[PDB]
Ligand binder design. Structure first.
Ligand SMILES: O=C1C=C(O)C[C@H](/C=C/[C@H]2CCCC[C@@H]2c2ccccc2)O1
Ligand SMILES: [Cl-]
Length: 134
């Protein structure tokens, strides 16, 4: 309990850097990158017992995952990858690893001041996405 209290809430994207390059590294195609890159999602995080739910809602896609920390799950990403995901808490940071077709990408979410900072990494390419409370 209270594992993720400082994450819970509704959050709105306010800045993005290097996201197109992250998506290219993942293998996202041109049209999806362009429409996805335009999106201004809200991220809605909630907890009920051991189950964490993260929703991403935008004009591009509305997605939802629910999970228990450390317990793998199957996820269809907004770009239609079929991945195996595990999310853990590492020193206060939510670490989300996605595996597919022999590839891996990690998305970290952390609280920094009044922001929720999301770092997306695929090999040598990192993208930073900043969210504030809605
Ligand atoms: O937790 C988060 C917070 C973030 O802002 C982005 C991050 C990754 C999402 C992208 C992965 C690659 C394909 C496009 C995906 C996408 C989904 C929804 C809306 C736009 C772009 O997920
Ligand atoms: Cl960007």
């Amino acid at each position: 309990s209270h594992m993720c209290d400082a994450f819970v809430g509704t959050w709105k994207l306010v800045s993005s850097e290097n996201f197109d390059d992250y998506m290219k590294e993942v293998g996202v195609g041109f049209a999806t990158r362009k429409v996805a890159g335009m999106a201004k999602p809200n991220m809605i995080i909630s907890v009920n017992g051991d189950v964490i739910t993260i929703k991403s809602e935008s004009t591009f896609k509305n997605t939802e995952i629910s999970f228990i920390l450390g317990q793998e799950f199957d996820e269809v990403t907004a770009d239609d990858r079929k991945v195996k995901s595990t999310i853990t808490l590492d020193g206060g940071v939510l670490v989300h690893v996605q595996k597919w077709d022999g590839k891996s990408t990690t998305i970290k979410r952390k609280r920094e001041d009044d922001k929720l900072v999301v770092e997306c990494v695929m090999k040598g390419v990192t993208s930073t996405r900043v969210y504030e409370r809605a």
